């Protein structure tokens, strides 16, 4: 993961969990990203 990533819908929020964790598959909630960094990777 749960992140404070100001966003709108995780089709958006989901490239800094990509280009920081490089996991993405993020979750744009609480107007903020969620992620799960469960992609191996």
Known sequence: ????IPCR???DCYE???KKYN???AKC???H???Y???PW
Do not use: I
Not at 1 to 4: G, K, L
């Open 1 to 4: 993961v749960h992140t404070n």
């Open 9 to 11: 819908g995780t089709s």
């Open 23 to 25: 996991c993405a598959r």
């Open 29 to 31: 909630m609480n107007r």
């Open 16 to 18: 800094p969990c990509e």
């Open 33 to 35: 990203c969620n992620c």
């Open 37 to 39: 960094n469960n992609c």
